[PDB]
Design a protein around this ligand. Structure first.
Ligand code: PC1
Ligand code: PC1
Ligand code: 3PE
Ligand code: 3PE
Ligand code: 3PE
Ligand code: 3PE
Ligand code: 3PE
Ligand code: 3PE
Ligand code: 9Z9
Ligand code: 4YH
Ligand code: NAG
Ligand code: CA
Ligand code: CA
Lengths: 46, 1274, 49
């Protein structure tokens, strides 16, 4: 009695790492972004 | 002074009494009492020597002397309240407090016949501060610099709390099981191993000791002190980790119990985040504060105090050189020795015989040949008389008087006199086995003679003597702090480290000298947690009051280190300032003097040139660097190591293709592209080449332009450190020699400390487990040598580097204090005066280290702004306010329409809401830090009643917010998104905890993250946070250098030491090793943080037991180790340190605008609040607003930006029309240009006709306008 | 158009289109374990054994 995963653990451990990290990167790619100057503000005119 | 209405002068000539010596008699009295609190000897269990009694008797005298003066100052001054005038001063309050407290304790004691009230006497030294009116001022500047650290304090406090709670849940009660011998109640552990958690079935570690089983009634990892059972212990352990001392210990215990797959995240993040980040922020704010203070001095009057007197001294020596040659200017050979002394022959042949005496000292080692000893003494003999004659010929050849004149000459007198003084001394017969040595080293002093020819050294020395002269008053305070804590130590811990074990605790507070050393030790932070544990055990253990002693150590460390900060920062700031100031002054002195005497081939370039080619190649470096890191060290016969070898032969065909195509078009960085490609094809001494195969990640420094330019800058930082490094490396060497003269052949000892000779340590001896005269095992006796010693000059030096990194320096210190005679084992507490050597070295090194670090900073500054100039009509404060006024912009408030939605919007935006929510989040916090290990079942369910009820409340606030922002403006605020995230997760958590019991320790972490909302209101913390979090993004290449550092090293590391077996009790084990890539990187981080790296270095040396998996001729298991571990480790340490100081400087500088802002006058902090009032007049931006709301805008403004605390009828009515503004249609004046003349008024204020001249300047020194200034010109 | 039609946000959003189906590949296929007594070889999943 042993254990071995071949077809659908490493599938979901490639869909975990996809959805967990394609979500955090979409988050940082979707926000307004850091202003980088005093005039710039997060969430502003335009 | 005079009361002006007191009682008459029937006795009130007390104000006559107090003239000159009563201020000094009392001072020496407060000094003698200090000398008395220190000669005291704390004895355990109530014993007492007859001298302590004598001291208590003298105590009464001391008391009566401090108690009458506290009445003779409420006589002078005036009545109850005029004495209050005495009390008016803050210091008197302390004086009164002292004496009062004293007699109080005395009387109490008497009546009884309290052992605590005696701990308040260690306060009297403070009184030594009221006296010296200088110390007062320093104590003042220390409290003012600490005022702007409030925002960082909040942050650090909340960081510890958050981590503490996460720690709590995460590992609360998971460390109570340890390996036990079966049936017995004894802990099973190897030799140099610490008892650690264990686990029966699971990810944790299992029992490995024979006849050992996993039990579970264990108090904890450090005598039940380090764990996460409640909020208090959790908090303590977290702070301990944040200080960076013993953090890996905690990380390993959590692994050993939960599995190593996840607890690493928590810890690394902590050390990184908390520790390093916080350090940066604190170093930054302080630096800023110091700069402003210096600026306050230099612009007031302090530049001309140090320029004149440095010029009036160099004009004095020029005046006195015009005299001393006029006074000086019998036979012919006495003039031929005048020609020679100043020549260039004699300069190159004083360096000849000084180099023979440096070589001899270095030559001195333990067990040296007989011809060597002979030769050394021979040379010194062939030199004492050679030193006799030149001195003899010098003082008689050019005059007996002006020989006295030379600073250098005075020392040449001292050499031969004490050089020949030891000639008959060592011959007399006294000396002994320690003096005949201290004499020998002195010969080292002759190198100083060369200083005479070393002009640089002479000056840099005065430069160094100036900084140490200014911080003189700060330094005294540091010592005063140390003495006081040493005394408090003697009081809480003196005579209590009396546990019935055979374990020796060298760091205690038994007497004054020892207590001093322990305090210094806790101050360097080396092993401070271990020192604290002893103190805790001295009060019963980790229980209620018993633990409260740990507050002593916390305070000590923290505060003492704050004083250290001041010292170092002050030294740097004053020092850096002088260097910029006088080096530039000697530069304006420089060239003003030198002006006076003067007065088919194309498509392969297309592909190579093409941009896509690069993104196709820089992800073959991303694959080939994953193939170096996936290699298996121990087993070369693996299928993994074979099938990665085909990935070797894949890519190094392709970089060949890149190479040959590159020499189809073109005919230093490309000799590196040739080398990498050849190495693989050759590798398919082979062993040596393989290490040189990790160089591939270094071929990506040319492809990217960002990387190329920063290795250039780093290489330029190691060119402006010459005179200082020279002084420093001279220091290291000299101290190494002193060490060899003091501890040569004295770092040897026996297994059982009974045998003192090598002859004696033969045979076998008994060892006793837990000091049980009934439980003993047999062991062979062996004469061992300490790993770090002072046998030769290359050894003493390695020792000093480690003592300089503060890693394991107390061990060395104690071995030295125990040193006996050459070839003889230790004698407990033999010579405690060696501690002096150790402490002085540490101090001097700290000083010189700082200077070198600061100089590197100055070079970088020159690379940046220091080199640059901007002499246009607009200064610093104009560029950071006008360019902001050009590039500004509107906002988005979203005031919506209608009463039902608008009213809802109002409740939620009301202050009753802010405060309420805040209060609720505070309560939730308090309810989280309430969980502990082993609570009740009624406590168990109301925690699920509450966590579902808090979710409710929060999901009920979000609803309101959503209803009041149509979901368009709700998800518009970056904080609302965070709110949403928290809510959803918190709910899922509840539902989970539910579907669990109806029929994931990651969701219970959503409760804790709520605290981050608090950061939504704190505007100073948020602001500071953003400021720095914004710089770490402007400099992403330096961080890349660090990353690349760890990568190369990890790879080389694996290769070099990836086969050493993981044996317990050693430094290479299951928690620390080079077996896998991730593990190697963890090890290096551990090293960068300075956690016992020197012990690792030794663990990675030659004769190490090989992993069973690795192959080897039956009889070669012990051939695995490499003495290359010395170059690897030292080099990694240094390079690492270098890169780190280069990242802090970078960030700090790029942020100096906000740091040294002097928030008084102006910043963008006024320019922010303008728009946040303008947001109430703009829903969305649109540019302009009505003119009816313009006058109501100026009523909302702070008066340093707008108009006063006066009424706006006269100044604010007249100025708004008279100062310029653009005139468009009736209710249209723009955002973009109203803010201009509103800040053009407040500073940079101009006369009429030249309204084009402000617009003239706003195009040259400013960036291209972009066409927006055409309304900001008019 | 700047946060929704940039390519850097659509490379990521197409990447989620891969993980939306690979997590659907897992949630129907029951192949992520092998019972191996030695025949009683069983393949576990969520829904079928
Ligand atoms: C912005 C400013 C920048 C400042 C720059 C400063 C940064 C300095 C860098 C220091 C960071 C230190 C990181 C330490 C890493 C700790 C890892 C660890 O200890 O794990 C132990 C273990 C390793 O297992 P193991 O091999 O010990 O297993 C043996 C099992 N026992 C112990 C029972 C015998 O945990 C893991 O398995 C996690 C895997 C590690 C993955 C984490 C990434 C590490 C860094 C990259 C290497 C990973 C390769 C690529 C991964 C692909 C993506 C998943
Ligand atoms: C996905 C990545 C994270 C996964 C964490 C995880 O799954 O842990 C489960 C594991 C659970 O361990 P376990 O699965 O072995 O279970 C322990 C015991 N039983 C089985 C009974 C539950 O948690 C850990 O062991 C380590 C958690 C590390 C998480 C670090 C979070 C802190 C770092 C961020 C702090 C932010 C501060 C902001 C300021
Ligand atoms: C101007 C500035 C004004 C303030 C100046 C600073 C005030 C300092 C006040 C404290 C001074 C106390 C030092 C004198 C003293 O009494 O030291 C006693 C201590 C006893 O040690 P000892 O007798 O050598 O025996 C050791 C083993 N039992 O002897 C020692 O241990 C000496 C240790 C070195 C102290 C440094
Ligand atoms: C602050 C410094 C440390 C606080 C001390 C906390 C503490 O002492 O908690 C211990 C206590 C454990 O309960 P105990 O009685 O030991 O359980 C016996 C059952 N066998 O458990 C407690 O009662 C602790 C309850 C208070 C801890 C919550 C504090 C959180 C504060 C967060 C502030 C937010 C800002
Ligand atoms: C400038 C700096 C100037 C600072 C000088 C001011 C001195 C501070 C006064 C501190 C006096 C502490 C008195 C409490 C004490 O000594 O402990 C009482 C108690 C005794 O218990 P005991 O039987 O001796 O030990 C076995 C325990 N089961 O055991 C306990 O209750 C433990 C309490 C010890 C807490 C000590 C706190 C020291 C804080 C240092 C501040 C700096
Ligand atoms: C509980 C919360 C305590 C806050 C602890 C802050 C953490 C400091 C830190 O980042 O530690 C890293 C560093 C490690 O240094 P290392 O040489 O590796 O050992 O450790 C250090 O460098 C220590 C630096 C400590 C500086 C503290 C400055 C904060 C201001 C404190 C003001 C209180 C002191 C008052 C002094 C007045 C003098 C009488
Ligand atoms: C100059 C800076 C050097 C700092 C001082 C290091 C001194 C250490 C040393 O001298 O090592 C000699 C060491 C002695 O060996 P021993 O302890 O007697 O043990 C028996 C050995 N079989 O035996 C050895 O083999 C050690 C030799 C290795 C020397 C260390 C290599 C230093 C590399 C530093 C490169 C980084 C420089 C970049 C600087 C950036 C910022 C400063
Ligand atoms: C996670 C997803 C996004 C979470 C971040 C939400 C908060 C945020 O991003 O705001 C950053 C904020 C921007 O700074 P701001 O004040 O707008 O700049 C004006 C110019 N003076 O300024 C800040 O950066 C505040 C500190 C942000 C760090 C919070 C850590 C969040 C991670 C959990
Ligand atoms: O004007 C300048 C004078 C020098 C000074 C005070 C300035 C900015 C950064 C300061 C440095 C930050 C670094 O921070 C440290 C401490 C943390 C270490 C990682 C290395 O860098 C200091 C050595 C380094 C430091 C304190 C040396 C002195 C520097 C302003
Ligand atoms: C391996 O490289 C490093 C490892 C750790 C650290 C963190 C500590 N840093 C060296 C800063 C310590 C320096 C400093 C602080 N803070 C400090 C000096 C002496 C100290 O005790 C006497 C002290 O440690 C408590 C801190 C001074 C110079 C400001 C930095 C590193 O690079 C410098
Ligand atoms: C008390 C105990 O467990 N003794 C064991 C013994 O039984 C075994 O033969 C040997 C080999 O592992 O190790 C030891
Ligand atoms: Ca340390
Ligand atoms: Ca340490």
């Amino acid at each position: 009695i042993e254990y071995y995963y071949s077809w659908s653990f490493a599938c979901a451990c490639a869909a975990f790492v996809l959805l967990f990290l394609g979500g955090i990167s979409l988050l940082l790619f979707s926000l307004p972004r850091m202003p980088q100057n005093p005039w710039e503000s997060c969430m502003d005119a335009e | 002074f005079c009361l002006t209405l007191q009682n008459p002068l029937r006795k009130a000539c007390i104000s006559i009494v107090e003239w000159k010596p009563f201020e000094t008699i009392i001072l020496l009295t407060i000094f003698a009492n200090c000398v008395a609190l220190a000669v005291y000897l704390p004895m355990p269990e109530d014993d007492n020597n007859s001298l302590n009694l004598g001291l208590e008797k003298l105590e009464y005298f001391f008391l009566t002397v401090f108690s009458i003066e506290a009445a003779m100052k409420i006589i002078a001054y005036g009545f109850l309240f005029h004495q209050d005038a005495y009390l008016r001063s803050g210091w008197n309050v302390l004086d009164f407090i002292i004496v009062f407290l004293g007699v109080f304790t005395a009387i109490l004691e008497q009546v009884n016949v309290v052992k605590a009230l005696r701990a308040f006497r260690v306060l009297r030294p403070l009184r030594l501060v009221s006296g010296v009116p200088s110390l007062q001022v320093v104590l003042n500047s220390i409290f003012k610099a600490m005022l702007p650290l409030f925002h960082i304090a909040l942050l650090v406090l909340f960081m510890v709390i958050i981590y503490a709670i996460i720690g709590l849940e995460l590992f609360k009660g998971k460390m109570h099981k340890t390996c036990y011998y079966i049936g017995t109640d004894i802990v099973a552990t190897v030799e140099n191993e610490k008892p650690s958690p264990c686990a029966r079935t699971g990810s944790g570690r299992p029992c490995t000791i024979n006849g050992s089983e996993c039990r579970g009634g264990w108090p904890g990892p450090n005598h039940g002190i380090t764990h996460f059972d409640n909020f208090g212990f959790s908090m303590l352990t977290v702070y301990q980790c944040i200080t960076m001392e013993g953090w890996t210990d905690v990380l390993y215990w959590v692994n050993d119990a939960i599995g190593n797959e996840w607890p690493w995240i928590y810890f690394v993040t902590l050390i990184l985040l908390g520790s390093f980040f916080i350090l940066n922020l604190v170093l930054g704010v302080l630096s800023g504060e110091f700069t402003k203070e210096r600026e306050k001095a230099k612009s007031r009057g302090t530049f001309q105090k140090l320029r004149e007197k440095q010029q009036l001294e160099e004009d004095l020596r020029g005046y006195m050189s015009w005299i001393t040659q006029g006074e000086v200017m019998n036979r012919v050979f006495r003039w031929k020795c005048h020609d020679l002394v100043k020549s260039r022959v004699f300069y190159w042949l004083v360096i000849l015989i000084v180099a023979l005496n440096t070589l001899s000292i270095a030559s001195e080692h333990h067990n040296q040949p007989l011809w060597l000893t002979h030769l050394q003494d021979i040379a010194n003999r062939v030199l004492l008389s050679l030193f006799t004659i030149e001195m003899l010929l010098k003082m008689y050849g050019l005059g007996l008087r002006q020989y006295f004149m030379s600073i250098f000459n005075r020392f040449d007198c001292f050499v031969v006199c004490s050089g020949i003084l030891e000639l008959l001394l060592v011959e007399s017969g006294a000396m002994t086995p320690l003096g005949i040595s201290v004499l020998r080293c002195i010969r080292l002093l002759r190198l100083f003679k060369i200083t005479k020819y070393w002009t640089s050294l002479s000056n840099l020395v005065a430069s160094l003597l100036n900084s140490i002269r200014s911080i003189a008053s700060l330094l005294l305070l540091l010592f005063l702090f140390i003495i006081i804590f040493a005394l408090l130590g003697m009081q809480l811990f003196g005579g209590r480290y009396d546990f019935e074990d055979t374990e020796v605790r060298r760091s205690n507070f038994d007497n004054f000298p020892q207590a001093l050393i322990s305090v210094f030790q806790v101050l360097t932070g080396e092993d401070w947690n271990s020192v604290m544990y002893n103190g805790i055990m001295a009060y019963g253990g980790p229980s209620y009051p018993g633990v409260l002693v740990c507050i002593y150590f916390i305070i000590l460390f923290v505060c003492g280190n704050y004083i250290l900060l001041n010292v170092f920062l002050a030294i740097a700031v004053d020092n850096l300032a002088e260097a910029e100031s006088l080096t530039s002054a000697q530069k304006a002195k420089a060239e003003e003097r030198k002006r006076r005497k003067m007065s088919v081939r194309v498509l392969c370039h297309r592909i190579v040139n093409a941009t896509w080619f690069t993104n196709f190649i820089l992800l073959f470096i991303l694959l080939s660097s994953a193939a170096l890191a996936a290699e298996d060290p121990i087993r070369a016969e693996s299928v993994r190591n074979q099938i990665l070898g085909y990935f070797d032969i894949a890519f190094t065909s392709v970089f060949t293709v890149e190479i040959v195509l590159k020499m189809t078009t073109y005919g230093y960085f490309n000799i590196l592209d040739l080398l990498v490609v050849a190495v693989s094809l050759i590798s398919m001494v082979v062993k040596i080449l393989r290490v040189l195969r990790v160089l591939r990640p270094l071929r990506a420094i040319n492809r990217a332009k960002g990387l190329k330019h920063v290795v250039q800058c780093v290489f330029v930082a190691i060119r402006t450190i010459g005179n200082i490094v020279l002084v420093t490396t001279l220091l290291q060497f000299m101290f190494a020699c002193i060490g060899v003269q003091l501890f040569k052949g004295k770092f040897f000892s026996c297994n059982d400390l009974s045998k003192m000779t090598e002859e004696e340590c033969r045979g076998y001896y008994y060892v006793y487990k837990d000091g049980d005269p009934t439980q003993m095992e047999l062991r062979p006796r062996q004469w061992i040598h300490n790993d770090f010693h002072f046998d030769n000059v290359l050894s003493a030096m390695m020792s000093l580097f480690t003592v300089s990194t503060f890693e394991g320096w107390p061990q060395l210190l104690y071995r030295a204090i125990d040193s006996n005679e050459e070839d003889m084992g230790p004698v407990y507490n033999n010579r405690v005066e060696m501690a002096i050597f150790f402490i002085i070295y540490i101090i001097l090194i700290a000083f010189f280290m700082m200077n070198i670090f600061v100089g590197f900073v100055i070079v970088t500054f020159q690379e940046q702004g220091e080199t640059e100039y901007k002499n246009c009509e607009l200064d610093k404060n104009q560029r950071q306010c006008v360019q902001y006024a050009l590039k500004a912009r509107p906002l988005r408030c979203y005031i919506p329409k209608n009463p039902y939605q608008y009213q809802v919007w109002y409740v939620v935006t009301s202050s009753y809401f802010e405060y309420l929510m805040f209060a609720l989040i505070m309560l939730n916090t308090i309810c989280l830090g309430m969980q502990h290990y082993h609570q009740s079942e009624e406590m168990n369910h109301i925690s699920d009643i509450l966590n579902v009820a808090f979710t409710i409340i929060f999901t009920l606030e979000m609803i309101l917010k959503l209803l009041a922002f149509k979901a368009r403006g709700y998800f518009g605020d970056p904080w609302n998104v965070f709110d949403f995230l928290i809510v959803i997760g918190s709910i899922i958590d509840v539902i989970l905890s539910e579907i669990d019991t109806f029929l994931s320790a990651f969701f219970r972490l959503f409760r804790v993250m709520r605290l981050i909302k608090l950061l939504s209101r704190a505007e100073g913390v948020r602001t500071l946070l953003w400021t720095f979090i914004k710089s770490f993004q402007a400099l992403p290449y330096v961080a890349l250098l660090i990353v690349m550092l760890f990568f190369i090293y990890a790879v080389i590391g694996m290769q070099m030491f990836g086969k050493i077996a993981l044996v317990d009790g050693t430094q290479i084990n299951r928690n620390n090793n080079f077996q896998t890539f991730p593990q190697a990187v963890l090890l290096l981080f551990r090293c960068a943080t300075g956690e016992a790296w020197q012990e690792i270095l030794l663990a990675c040396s030659y004769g190490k037991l090989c992993d069973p998996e690795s192959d080897y001729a039956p009889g070669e298991e012990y051939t695995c180790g490499t003495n290359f571990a010395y170059y690897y480790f030292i080099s990694f340490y240094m390079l690492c340190a270098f890169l780190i100081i280069n990242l802090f400087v970078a960030v700090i500088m790029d942020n100096f605008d906000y740091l040294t802002r002097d928030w008084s006058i102006l910043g963008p902090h006024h320019l922010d609040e303008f728009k946040a009032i303008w947001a109430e007049y703009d829903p969305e931006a649109k540019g302009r607003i009505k003119h009816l709301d313009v006058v109501t805008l100026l009523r909302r403004i702070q008066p340093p930006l707008g108009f006063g605390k006066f009424c706006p009828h006269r100044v604010a009515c007249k100025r708004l029309v008279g100062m310029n503004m653009p005139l468009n249609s009736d209710g249209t004046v723009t955002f973009n240009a109203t803010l201009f003349a509103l800040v053009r008024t407040a500073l940079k204020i101009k006369t009429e006709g030249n309204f084009e001249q402000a617009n003239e300047e706003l195009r040259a020194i400013i960036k291209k306008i972009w066409k927006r200034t055409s309304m900001k010109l008019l | 158009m700047s946060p929704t039609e940039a390519p850097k946000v659509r490379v990521t959003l197409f990447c989620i289109l891969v993980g939306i189906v690979l997590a659907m590949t897992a949630v129907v296929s029951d192949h992520w374990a092998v019972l191996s007594p030695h025949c009683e070889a069983a393949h576990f999943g969520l829904w079928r054994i």
